[PDB]
Each structure stands twice: as structure tokens, then as C-alpha cells.
């Protein structure tokens, strides 16, 4: 099982979506299903590597505009940050 | 009809020698672009390096802080307040 | 020090990649220097702007089906029957 | 270690890169990454699923007009095609 970890980044984000009424549910169950390794994901997901100088960090879309980015280790999964593409690469 | 973009000239000089080499031009990679655009109601992947919000938070993760552990799902769900 | 891109382009394919790209917060100008200024970085193409050609598919379907697909033993018999 | 296949139009693909006089150095040092299981591939590759309703496809890049598309499974790497973008998706 991979250790679980969040940032305080992360927190943040989230608290931010649930403020602008995003649907909360449809981030939990793709948490859900990185903590269950159930992968790869749905095709829908669009799950990536994010494009860094950090290894082990990928992207998924919760919707078109709404991303979730989250490390991927043996051992570890880090939810790192969340929210529109103007809020993390904009 | 036509797509019209203020850019800057050597901007597009450079992306113009990289199509060319590929025997493409501007307006045939705008045309590409705004069709999987309008296709897939989606942005292409990659088209942004993370901001300075995400670097930070990347490299205070990094380095151990504001870092937070989660036993699992519940726990997790619960300390994030959903 | 500023030029202009101009691209003959489908009105309705135009006017709905507009609408893709205004519930993000961008225009299609937007998209079009973004995109340029990937490219004159990486020197490269973004990623996956085209799906595979009907010879790339056909080639699929073939190898899918065990249609004219050849088998090798390691690196340099590999190398061997296709000659390089 | 991956059984290593090869389609008759990789055959005919990688004939027409040697006619061009292409560097087929790059191309066999990737493909014996490949087949090593040297995985995931050095970043400089920018390996990437293949968009396609295919499973198992990839896309690397020998050069940045010279695509490498093979499938890969568990049990299986073949080599499917090669060329420019043109060629594959054009």
C-alpha cells in the first residue's frame, strides 16, 4: 500500500474549489482511485506526467479545466495541488 | 474566415523555422490546433510550465514542509474538510 | 518587434474553439501565442495533435489481427532482419 | 523479457529512413532501451501513450520529426511504424 501524503498547497486548493461550489464528489473518486491503485485510470481522466524537472509528478483532469496534480512513487502518493489550468500553470 | 494574433516577431520567426523544417506553416499549425481544440472541448497537453503557486508548493513539499500525512481515504477526506 | 498570424480557418470550426476556449478564460489569439511560444522553446510539436493516418491504422489493424507480424530473438537478430 | 515483434510496415518504414540516410544509431539505441525494459525512457525521448483508441500504444521521438510508435504490454514489444510526423499522422 503507498503511503499517503497532502500539502498544505493542496489543502488550500481544495477548500478553494469546495468555496466555488465545484462537485467535491468527482475529486474524492478520483482520489479514491489513486489510493486504491486502481490503475491506470478512465480514459477520461487524461492522466499524464507533469511537465517538470521533478520526477514522479503527474496530472489528471477532473473536468477540462479542473486538474488535479499529484506525485507517484513505489512507496508514496502526494496529493500536491488542485484547480483550473490559469491557477496552476497560468 | 481567419484567425488573427498579435505576436512577436521573433516568437514567430522561431516557431516558423520549426514548422518549416517540418513542412508545415503557422496557419497549419493554428488550423491542427483549433481542430483538437474543438474536437475534444479540451486543451492540448503540456502547453504551460507550472506556475510560481505550483513550483513553490513542489519544492516546499521537496524539502519536508507543510507536508501532511493521511492513514487513508477517511482520514484523508476528513482533515481536508469533504 | 510585432507581427501578426493570420490563418484562413472554418467559421463554425472557428466560433467552436472559441467557445472551448472562453469557458477557460482564453481566447483564441491566447491559444495561438501560447502555443507558438511552446514550439519556438522545445523546438517540437505539442503532443498528440493528430490522430494516427489511415497507413498507421491499417498497419494496427494488421498486426492486431497477427496479420504480417514478424518475431525476433533479441537486439541483433532485430537488427539483422530488418537489415540495419 | 518482453517477446519482440516487429509489423511488415516497420520493415518497410525503417528502409525508407535508411534510403533518407537517417541516423539509425538513435533509432537502435532506443529500441534497445525498449527492449532491455529500460523503462520509463530517458525524458529526452518524450515518450508518450499513442492517442488512439489502441491500448498499449506508444509514441517516443528518435528526433523531433522522427516518431517511433510500438506497442507494449507485459508480455509483448512490437515495433509498429516509424517516420515524420507526415508520414504517421498526416
Chains 1, 4 share one sequence.
Not at chain 1, 73 to 81: G, H, V, W
Amino acid at each position: 500500500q503507498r503511503d499517503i501524503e497532502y500539502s498544505g498547497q493542496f489543502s488550500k486548493d481544495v477548500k478553494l474549489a469546495q468555496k466555488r461550489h465545484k462537485d467535491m464528489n468527482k475529486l474524492k473518486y478520483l482520489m479514491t482511485l489513486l489510493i486504491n491503485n486502481t490503475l491506470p485510470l478512465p480514459a477520461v481522466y487524461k492522466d499524464h506526467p507533469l511537465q517538470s524537472s521533478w520526477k514522479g509528478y503527474r496530472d489528471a483532469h477532473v473536468e477540462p479545466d479542473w486538474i488535479l496534480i499529484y506525485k507517484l512513487t513505489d512507496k508514496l502518493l502526494r496529493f500536491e495541488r488542485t484547480g483550473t489550468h490559469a491557477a496552476l500553470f497560468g | 474566415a481567419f484567425v488573427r494574433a498579435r505576436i512577436d516577431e521573433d516568437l514567430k520567426n522561431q516557431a516558423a523555422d520549426v514548422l518549416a523544417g517540418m513542412g508545415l506553416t503557422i496557419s497549419d499549425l493554428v488550423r491542427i490546433t483549433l481542430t483538437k481544440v474543438a474536437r475534444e472541448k479540451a486543451l492540448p497537453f503540456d502547453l504551460r510550465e507550472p506556475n510560481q503557486l505550483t513550483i513553490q508548493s513542489i519544492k516546499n513539499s521537496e524539502a519536508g514542509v507543510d507536508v501532511h500525512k493521511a492513514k487513508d481515504a477517511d482520514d484523508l477526506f476528513d482533515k481536508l474538510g469533504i
